[PDB]
């Protein structure tokens, strides 16, 4: 007789030839996880072998750079305060006049 009668005896989990797409996906997935467990496995192998000996952990050559780069993204990201309801009458006025201080024939204020 033939062997064409395996409905539950084999759920496509015995031969990779049963599926070419799943075959390559199983080789790319297993190899991917290995690189993660390896790059992390050897990482502890060197971090513990030298223990902060070969890997420096204090490259603060530009202490002011950390002070500038930190306030550079926080200052430009805030630009003061866009929230109008969370600002006194002068607070929103400073931002409105700050933009109309260098060239302003009218301004963007149609209410108060």
UniProtKB/Swiss-Prot annotation:
Phosphothreonine modification, residue list: 56, 59
Chain segments carrying region Disordered: 30-61
Domain of life: Eukaryota
Residue span of region Interaction with UBQLN1: 3-68
Coiled-coil region: none
Biased composition (Basic and acidic residues): 30-43
Entry-annotated residues carrying Phosphoserine: 62, 72
Domain UIM, first and last residues per copy: 17-36, 88-107
Region (Essential for ubiquitin-binding) residue spans: 22-26, 93-97
Function as written in the Swiss-Prot or TrEMBL entry: Component of the 26S proteasome, a multiprotein complex involved in the ATP-dependent degradation of ubiquitinated proteins. This complex plays a key role in the maintenance of protein homeostasis by removing misfolded or damaged proteins, which could impair cellular functions, and by removing proteins whose functions are no longer required. Therefore, the proteasome participates in numerous cellular processes, including cell cycle progression, apoptosis, or DNA damage repair.
Family, per entry: Belongs to the proteasome subunit S5A family.
Domain comment, as recorded: The 2 UIM motifs are involved in the binding to a multi-ubiquitin chain in a cooperative way.
Subunit structure: Component of the 19S proteasome regulatory particle complex. The 26S proteasome consists of a 20S core particle (CP) and two 19S regulatory subunits (RP). The regulatory particle is made of a lid composed of 9 subunits, a base containing 6 ATPases and few additional components including PSMD4. Interacts with NUB1. Interacts with SQSTM1. Interacts with UBQLN4. Interacts with UBE3A. Interacts with UBQLN1 (via ubiquitin-like domain). Interacts with DDI2.
Protein name (record): 26S proteasome non-ATPase regulatory subunit 4
The species this protein was found in: Homo sapiens (Human)
Recorded name of the encoding gene: PSMD4
Span of the entire protein shown here: 195 to 306 of 377
């Amino acid at each position: 007789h033939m062997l064409g009668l395996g409905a539950s005896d084999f759920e496509f989990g015995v031969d990779p030839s049963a599926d070419p797409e799943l075959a390559l996906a199983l080789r790319v997935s297993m190899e991917e996880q290995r690189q993660r467990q390896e790059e992390e496995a050897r990482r502890a192998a060197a971090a513990s072998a030298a223990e902060a000996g070969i890997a420096t952990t204090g490259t603060e050559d530009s202490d002011d750079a950390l002070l500038k780069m930190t306030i550079s993204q926080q200052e430009f990201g805030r630009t003061g305060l866009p929230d109008l309801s969370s600002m006194t009458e002068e607070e929103q006025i400073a931002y409105a006049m700050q933009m109309s201080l260098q060239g302003a024939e009218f301004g963007q204020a149609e209410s108060a």
